[PDB]
Amino acid sequence: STINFANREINFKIVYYGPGLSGKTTNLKWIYSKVPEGRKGEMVSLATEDERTLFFDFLPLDIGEVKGFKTRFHLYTVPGQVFYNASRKLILRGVDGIVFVADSAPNRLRANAESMRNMRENLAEYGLTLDDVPIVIQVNKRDLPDALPVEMVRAVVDPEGKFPVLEAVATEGKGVFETLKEVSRLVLARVA
Numbered sequence: 001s002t003i004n005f006a007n008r009e010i011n012f013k014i015v016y017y018g019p020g021l022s023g024k025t026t027n028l029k030w031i032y033s034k035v036p037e038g039r040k041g042e043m044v045s046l047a048t049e050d051e052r053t054l055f056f057d058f059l060p061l062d063i064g065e066v067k068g069f070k071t072r073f074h075l076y077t078v079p080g081q082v083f084y085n086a087s088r089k090l091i092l093r094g095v096d097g098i099v100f101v102a103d104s105a106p107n108r109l110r111a112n113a114e115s116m117r118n119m120r121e122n123l124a125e126y127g128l129t130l131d132d133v134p135i136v137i138q139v140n141k142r143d144l145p146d147a148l149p150v151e152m153v154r155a156v157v158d159p160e161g162k163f164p165v166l167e168a169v170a171t172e173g174k175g176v177f178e179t180l181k182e183v184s185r186l187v188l189a190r191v192a
């Protein structure tokens with residue numbers, strides 16, 4: 001799948017993961033809203049009464065062309081509140097890099113912790129640990145008044161300081177493309 005000879009594309013999958021309502025859809029809508037019509041496909045949203053998923057692909061202008069191959073990024077997330085683990089497990093199939101979108105709200109601090117234990121455990125299903133996959137932490141919602149300090153959030157999701165961290169206010173685009181740029185850098189660094 002990653003190499004498509006017929007279209008001369010290399011495909012990478014980036015998953016936005018994190019607790020429900022932390023800003024993953026918003027990140028996806030902002031990125032989509034900025035790509036030119038000729039460089040992206042359809043945004044696809046799947047929903048049963050109980051589960052959800054959301055994705056689209058696009059050709060980032062910022063990446064160069066090896067041997068005539070353009071790069072194509074496929075962005076995925078499970079949006080909304082989760083009732084079943086199934087679509088989280090499946091969203092990680094063939095993942096190349098991960099953006100963890102943590103929430104700043106004080107009453108969402110455990111949810112951040114829980115969501116990261118859950119991702120670690122979903123990775124494990126595929127034989128992957130947190131070291132095997134580029135992970136970027138986005139600490140979203142820097143604007144809300146009682147917003148916890150970045151290091152307190154980072155303390156519960158990445159207690160060893162192993163992952164790049166970035167601030168965002170995704171409703172306004174701040175941090176959104178820096179975060180994507182950071183996870184991409186990591187993904188491409190592995191292919192060299």
Ligand SMILES: Nc1nc2c(ncn2[C@@H]2O[C@H](COP(=O)(O)OP(=O)(O)O)[C@@H](O)[C@H]2O)c(=O)[nH]1
Binds near residue numbers: 019
């Ligand atoms: N105050 C604030 N609200 C945000 C931010 N990002 C997203 N939201 C809001 O949080 C709610 C849930 O966001 P959404 O992206 O759907 O979360 P998802 O379930 O993780 O996809 C929505 O009403 C968003 O507008 C932010 O940076 N600051």
